[PDB]
């Protein structure tokens, strides 16, 4: 698996935010770092 999605471009999809992004896999979670 773990195509397409980068972690380090849905951590930026959920830092705009105050959150951390983690997108591991293809399935990306913004997440209260």
């Not at 773990?2 to 979670?29: H, P, Q, Y």
Request: proline share 3%; hydrophobic share 25%.
């Amino acid at each position: 698996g773990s195509a397409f999605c980068n972690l380090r471009r849905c951590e930026l999809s959920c830092r705009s935010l105050g959150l951390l992004g983690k997108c591991i896999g293809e399935e990306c979670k913004c997440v209260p770092y």
